């Protein structure tokens, strides 16, 4: 455990859309509407050391690699930024989209790949060494959330067409459609094993989908209720615990939602945010939670 | 008698064909300056000034960009001598800002909530046919 | 002393039929219509064809008598104060003469600002015992004819040169030979000879 | 000391009332629950 | 007269405390940020007649 | 649902995301400048407020006395810009 | 210059109509004082030429 | 039973509970002008029943016009009011 439980963090200036724990679990990156990326400590006194500029838009999605070396930022000026975890330089800026980049995700354990989705209907693949798009998938509609499998062979994509679509990289065809959400899917998260994938959607139902070679063909595994979406139409993100045992989801009624993955029971409904919440995230070693909301502030819950 | 001009150099080439109407617009402005406020409200009495200022500026704007009947030299003379507004012309070249009355009606510092005037709202988006006179300007729907 | 408290104490027939309100806050804008000390004036527009209502009395003078700051009616029932004190007791006896009024106001302001800031400081215990006849004539649904722009006094002389553009009503004012017409502010506020009540 | 310095600043603000005359636009939001529900009041809502 | 003007110059040069770097105030930029001041371009004589009538 | 409803839902997300992340709505966006006004505007204001005896301008009587405390600064800025005998 | 009971003049008619009565302005030698003669009696002389000053 | 509707409600100052929100400016003013233009808007209450999404207003016109806002291209386009026009600024005492 670190310091005293709470550790409220301020310094941000507008809405905070995203936040990620470092793969060792010793520092933190937060981002939002501020057109700024902040790198803060998780231990000691949790004080700022690095501020990262280099955007002309809202920094929508934030991620890491599995090493804690490369920092990937998806911004709302049709570009993606690639940085180093230390020393703070613009290493690789990649511009291919004709509209707003809603989400990005790095393919882990493979060769370096990033997949992004944008409002023009495009889902694009990106090799960091090539300065060019690798494959481009016109769905037809706006795409909000995009992630890989562990095998770096599929694109799992959520849009506003109420249907999670899985693209195969080798066939370049629409492999899977997952029906079961009644409104637009705003956030996807693939588990640490690759077995399960967590989804938020605007119909206020949090869904768990098993991504396996062998399927029951009706993949409606687990259903969570209580999550609130409203008129603000925010992009709501979900996250897995390191052991896959706990599930966090952002909500628009200012309550931090954490479910138990086996009993489908609300473990934690932590208050303390004036504004609607954007992303709740688990520390990779210890049960510590960074929660990021539109009230410009961050919270460190210690379980 | 004149506009007394502040250049002392002779005016440029195409001057003598736009001079009767500029002097006629200028005579109209000197009429509006002296109109005694009687049944003309405290904000309503400054509505002719913004309208004629719009009219003089639109006149030089129509001759240089639409009709192409004035050179750069004559055009910039009329801006320096105070016949056109350089800042109102600059907004009319923007995309949506093309019948703008005033520079006040797009100034967000001049309003309570930090916003434009309802003068600038598209008339389809009011949906009812309500009749509107902007208090700054007297305008009924620029946009 | 000044008043200076955030976010006024309002009913629902004056706060509007829209759940989205934009109000302005002026720090020491007007003086109170009763207390005569300056307070924080909040100005909002309820709906579309409304009047831009504003708070008329202090937070303190509404905490004394449990009322809304602009309609001066009970927050719970929506009735005049003479009706509610008729269906209760009248033991407040706020002074009306000058020096006594400012002295009573000073002392009650010290009393309220030496307390929590949540309860109608004297009206609470008597506000427990309720549900007299006032509940059987309490208004059920809001009377949005209150939030309504005044009669155009240029249209009364048949000389409204704004015509269709005037935001004031072109309809009849009430006949002044009516008991329901005089209605002073202090008469509505102290509970004395209020013809509505 | 943090409580005292604020009152000090509010006193000292009179000593120079207009030097770089003030600035005001932190336009803020507040969520309010009418405590009147029984709905015909917001239009059918619980908050505003 | 020359002796007295020298005296004024020497009293200037003696009691010269250095500029004392403050925070800049900009009064007229604060007036025209408000909704009560507009800006225009006028002949100096018109402004002088205005300032005299306003003081009166 | 239908292709019509999904296309309408696409339109009413594209318009929303366009008008919600415009270039004029970013965080450190200093909005447009207060510009110059026509010089006849202050002329008619000064001329209508003649000597402040009309009953129509009785609400601005309080503001002129308020402006009295800034008359020395206006005098200074006036005489600082006196026009230099070679200027007409 | 004006009388005590004399109200101040309106700027508008009385000075917008009237021509401004030539200033002092020494006649400069067109050969000997050539690099100065074009701009010497202007308000802020070489203001709109980027070669001799910066901007406005 | 010794408390009224006001005394049983979780209130903060004499008329209810007031807490600072942090709603996005555009979406707030969107729903505000949506109610002020047509007569309906989405609900900004944060629980109220804790199920999905209800409209609060003249809800009958909400489904008629599909729940559109002011920032979006409208369904109806008819019965425009006719006005004079003289956009030339060349004829004096005829320009409007
Ligand atoms: Zn306007
Ligand atoms: Zn205008
Ligand atoms: Zn206009
Ligand atoms: Zn009071
Ligand atoms: Zn009221
Ligand atoms: Zn009228």
Curated annotation (Swiss-Prot), chain A:
Entry keyword annotation includes Plastid: no
UniProt crosslink position (Glycyl lysine isopeptide (Lys-Gly) (interchain with G-Cter in SUMO2)): 217
WD repeats: 11-50, 54-93, 96-136, 138-177, 180-219, 230-269, 272-303
Record keywords, A-Z: Isopeptide bond, Methylation, mRNA processing, mRNA splicing, Nucleus, Repeat, Spliceosome, Ubl conjugation, WD repeat
Localization (cell): Nucleus
Origin: domain of life: Eukaryota
Phosphoprotein among keywords: no
GO terms assigned for molecular function: RNA binding
A single Gene Ontology CC term: U4/U6 x U5 tri-snRNP complex
A single BP term in Gene Ontology: RNA splicing, via transesterification reactions
Known role: Required for pre-mRNA splicing as component of the activated spliceosome. Component of the U5 small nuclear ribonucleoprotein (snRNP) complex and the U4/U6-U5 tri-snRNP complex, building blocks of the spliceosome. As a component of the minor spliceosome, involved in the splicing of U12-type introns in pre-mRNAs.
Subunit structure: Component of the pre-catalytic and catalytic spliceosome complexes. Component of the postcatalytic spliceosome P complex. Part of the U5 snRNP complex. Interacts with PRPF8. Component of the U4/U6-U5 tri-snRNP complex composed of the U4, U6 and U5 snRNAs and at least PRPF3, PRPF4, PRPF6, PRPF8, PRPF31, SNRNP200, TXNL4A, WDR57, SNRNP40, DDX23, CD2BP2, PPIH, SNU13, EFTUD2, SART1 and USP39. Component of the minor spliceosome, which splices U12-type introns.
Protein name: U5 small nuclear ribonucleoprotein 40 kDa protein
Organism: Homo sapiens
Coverage span on the entire protein: 54 to 356 of 357
Swiss-Prot record, chain C:
Source organism superkingdom: Eukaryota
Phosphoserine modifications at: 89
Cross-link (Glycyl lysine isopeptide (Lys-Gly) (interchain with G-Cter in SUMO2)): 126, 136
Subcellular location, record wording: Nucleus; Cytoplasm
Subunit structure: Component of the pre-catalytic and catalytic spliceosome complexes. Component of the postcatalytic spliceosome P complex. Interacts with PDCD6; the interaction induces translocation of PDCD6 in the cytoplasm. Interacts with PPIL1.
Function: Required for pre-mRNA splicing as component of the activated spliceosome. Involved in the first step of pre-mRNA splicing. Binds directly to the internal stem-loop (ISL) domain of the U6 snRNA and to the pre-mRNA intron near the 5' splice site during the activation and catalytic phases of the spliceosome cycle. Involved in both translocations of the nuclear SLU7 to the cytoplasm and the cytosolic calcium-binding protein PDCD6 to the nucleus upon cellular stress responses.
Domain notes: The C-terminal RRM domain and the zinc finger motif are necessary for RNA-binding.
Name of the protein described by the UniProt record: Pre-mRNA-splicing factor RBM22
Taxonomic placement: Eukaryota, Metazoa, Chordata, Craniata, Vertebrata
Swiss-Prot record, chain D:
Lineage top rank: taxon: Eukaryota
Subcellular location: Nucleus
Residue numbers of Phosphoserine PTMs: 35, 43
Linked residues for Glycyl lysine isopeptide (Lys-Gly) (interchain with G-Cter in SUMO2): 11, 23, 46
Family, similarity comment: Belongs to the SNW family.
Function: Involved in pre-mRNA splicing as component of the spliceosome. As a component of the minor spliceosome, involved in the splicing of U12-type introns in pre-mRNAs. Required for the specific splicing of CDKN1A pre-mRNA; the function probably involves the recruitment of U2AF2 to the mRNA. May recruit PPIL1 to the spliceosome. May be involved in cyclin-D1/CCND1 mRNA stability through the SNARP complex which associates with both the 3'end of the CCND1 gene and its mRNA. Involved in transcriptional regulation.
SUBUNIT field: Identified in the spliceosome C complex. Associates with U4/U6-U5 tri-small nuclear ribonucleoproteins (U4/U6-U5 tri-snRNPs). Component of the minor spliceosome, which splices U12-type introns. Interacts with SKI, SMAD2,SMAD3, RBPJ, RB1, PABPN1, MAGEA1, SIRT1, FOXN3, U2AF2, DAXX and ATP1B4. Interacts with PPIL1. Interacts with VDR and RXRA; preferentially associates with VDR:RXRA heterodimers. Interacts with NCOR2. Interacts with MAML1. Interacts with NOTCH1 NICD; the interaction involves multimerized NOTCH1 NICD.
Full protein name: SNW domain-containing protein 1
Organism: Homo sapiens
From Swiss-Prot, chain E:
Domain of life: Eukaryota
Location of this chain's protein in the cell: Nucleus; Nucleus speckle
UniProt tissue specificity: Widely expressed.
Subunit structure of this chain's protein: Part of the U5 snRNP complex. Component of the U4/U6-U5 tri-snRNP complex composed of the U4, U6 and U5 snRNAs and at least PRPF3, PRPF4, PRPF6, PRPF8, PRPF31, SNRNP200, TXNL4A, SNRNP40, DDX23, CD2BP2, PPIH, SNU13, EFTUD2, SART1 and USP39. Component of the U5.U4atac/U6atac snRNP complexes in U12-dependent spliceosomes. Within the minor spliceosome, which acts on U12-type introns, interacts with PPIL2 and RBM48. Core component of U2-type precatalytic, catalytic and postcatalytic spliceosomal complexes. Found in a mRNA splicing-dependent exon junction complex (EJC) with SRRM1.
Summary of the function given for this chain in its UniProt record: Plays a role in pre-mRNA splicing as core component of precatalytic, catalytic and postcatalytic spliceosomal complexes, both of the predominant U2-type spliceosome and the minor U12-type spliceosome. Functions as a scaffold that mediates the ordered assembly of spliceosomal proteins and snRNAs. Required for the assembly of the U4/U6-U5 tri-snRNP complex, a building block of the spliceosome. Functions as a scaffold that positions spliceosomal U2, U5 and U6 snRNAs at splice sites on pre-mRNA substrates, so that splicing can occur. Interacts with both the 5' and the 3' splice site.
Species assigned in the record: Homo sapiens (Human)
């Amino acid at each position: 455990s670190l310091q005293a439980p709470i550790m409220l963090l301020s310094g941000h200036e507008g809405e905070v859309y995203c936040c990620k724990f470092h793969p060792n679990g010793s520092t933190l990156a937060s981002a939002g509407f501020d057109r700024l990326i902040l790198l803060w400590n998780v231990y000691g006194d949790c004080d700022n050391y690095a501020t990262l500029k280099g955007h002309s838009g809202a920094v929508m999605e934030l991620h890491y690699n599995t090493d804690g070396s490369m920092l990937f930022s998806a911004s709302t000026d049709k570009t993606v930024a690639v940085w180093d975890s230390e020393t703070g330089e613009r290493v690789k800026r990649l511009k291919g989209h004709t509209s707003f980049v809603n989400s990005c995700y790095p393919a882990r354990r493979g060769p370096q790949l990033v997949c992004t989705g944008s409002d023009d209907g495009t889902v694009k693949l990106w090799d960091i060494r090539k300065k060019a798009a690798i494959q481009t998938f016109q769905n037809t509609y706006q795409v909000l959330a995009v992630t890989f499998n562990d095998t770096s062979d599929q694109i799992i994509s959520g849009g506003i067409d109420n249907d999670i679509k899985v693209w195969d990289l080798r066939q370049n065809k629409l492999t899977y459609t997952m029906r079961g959400h009644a409104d637009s899917v705003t956030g996807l998260s693939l588990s640490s094993e690759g077995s399960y994938l967590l989804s938020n959607a605007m119909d206020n139902t949090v869904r768990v989908w098993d991504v396996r070679p062998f399927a029951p063909k009706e993949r409606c595994v687990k259903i969570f209720q209580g999550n609130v979406h409203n008129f603000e139409k925010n992009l709501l993100r979900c996250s897995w615990s390191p052991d896959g045992s706990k599930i966090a989801a952002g909500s628009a009624d200012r309550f931090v939602y954490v479910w138990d993955t086996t009993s489908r029971r609300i473990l934690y409904k932590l208050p303390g945010h004036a504004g609607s919440i954007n992303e709740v995230a688990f520390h990779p070693d210890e049960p510590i939670i960074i929660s990021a909301s539109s009230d410009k502030r961050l919270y460190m819950g210690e379980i | 008698m004149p506009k007394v001009k502040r250049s002392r150099k002779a005016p440029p080439d195409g001057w003598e064909l736009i001079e009767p109407t500029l002097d006629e617009l200028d005579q109209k402005m000197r009429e509006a300056e002296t109109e005694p406020h009687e049944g003309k409200r405290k904000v309503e009495s400054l509505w002719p000034i913004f309208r004629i200022h719009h009219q003089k500026t639109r006149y030089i704007f129509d001759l240089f960009y639409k009709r192409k009947a004035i050179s750069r030299e004559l055009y910039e003379y009329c801006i320096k001598e105070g016949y056109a507004d350089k800042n109102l012309i600059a907004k009319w070249k923007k995309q949506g800002y093309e019948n703008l009355c005033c520079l006040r009606c797009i100034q967000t510092r001049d309003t309570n909530f930090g916003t434009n005037c309802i003068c600038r709202v598209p008339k389809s988006k009011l949906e009812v046919g309500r009749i509107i006179e902007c208090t700054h300007c007297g305008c009924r729907g620029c946009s | 002393n000044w008043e200076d408290a955030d976010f006024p104490i309002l009913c629902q027939t004056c706060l509007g039929e829209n759940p989205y309100i934009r109000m302005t806050k002026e720090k020491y804008g007007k003086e109170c219509k009763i207390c005569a000390r300056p307070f924080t004036v909040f100005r909002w527009c309820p709906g579309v064809r409304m009047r831009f209502k504003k708070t008329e009395v202090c937070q303190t003078c509404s905490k004394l008598k449990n009322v809304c700051q602009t309609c001066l009616l009970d927050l719970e029932y929506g009735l005049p104060i003479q009706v509610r004190d008729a269906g209760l007791s009248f033991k407040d006896d706020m002074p009306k003469s000058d020096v006594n009024k400012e002295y009573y106001t000073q002392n009650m302001e010290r009393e309220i600002s030496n307390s929590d800031g949540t309860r109608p400081v004297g009206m609470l215990g008597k506000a427990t015992s309720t549900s007299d006849m006032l509940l059987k004539l309490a208004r059920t649904t809001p009377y949005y004819k209150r939030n309504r722009p005044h009669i155009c006094s240029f249209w009364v002389k048949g000389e409204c040169k704004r015509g269709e553009e005037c935001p004031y009503r072109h309809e009849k004012p009430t006949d002044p030979d009516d008991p329901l017409a005089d209605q002073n502010i202090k008469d509505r506020y102290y509970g004395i000879n209020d013809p509505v009540a | 000391r943090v409580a005292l310095e604020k009152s000090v600043s509010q006193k000292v603000a009179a000593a120079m009332p207009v030097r770089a005359a003030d600035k005001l636009a932190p336009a803020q939001y507040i969520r309010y629950t009418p405590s009147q529900q029984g709905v015909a009041f917001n239009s059918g809502a619980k908050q505003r | 007269s020359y002796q007295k003007l020298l005296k004024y110059y020497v009293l200037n040069a003696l009691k010269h405390r250095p500029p004392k770097a403050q925070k800049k105030r900009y009064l007229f930029r604060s007036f025209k940020a408000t909704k009560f001041f507009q800006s225009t371009k006028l002949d100096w004589v018109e402004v002088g007649l205005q300032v005299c009538r306003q003081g009166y | 649902m239908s292709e019509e409803k999904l296309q309408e839902k696409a339109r009413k997300w594209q318009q929303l995301q366009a008008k919600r992340y415009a270039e004029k709505r970013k965080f450190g966006f200093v909005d447009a400048q207060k510009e110059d006004m026509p010089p006849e505007h202050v002329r008619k204001i000064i001329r209508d407020h003649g000597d402040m005896t009309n009953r129509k301008f009785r609400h601005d009587k309080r503001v002129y006395l308020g402006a009295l405390k800034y008359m020395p600064h206006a005098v200074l800025k006036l005489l600082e810009n006196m026009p230099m005998p070679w200027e007409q | 210059p004006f009388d005590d009971e004399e109200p101040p003049l309106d700027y508008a008619d009385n000075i917008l109509d009237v021509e401004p009565l030539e200033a002092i302005q020494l006649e400069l030698d067109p050969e000997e004082d050539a690099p100065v003669l074009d701009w010497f009696y202007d308000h802020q002389p070489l203001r709109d030429s980027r070669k001799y000053v910066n901007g406005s | 039973p010794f408390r009224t509707q006001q005394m049983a409600a979780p209130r903060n100052m004499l008329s209810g509970y007031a807490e600072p929100a942090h709603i996005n400016d555009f979406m707030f003013e969107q729903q505000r002008r949506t109610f002020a233009t047509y007569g309906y808007a989405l609900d900004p209450s944060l629980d109220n029943h804790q199920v999905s999404a209800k409209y609060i207003g003249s809800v009958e016109e909400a489904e008629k016009n599909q729940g559109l806002t002011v920032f979006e291209t409208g369904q109806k386009k008819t019965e425009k009011r006719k006005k004079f026009k003289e956009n030339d600024a060349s004829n004096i005492d005829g320009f409007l």
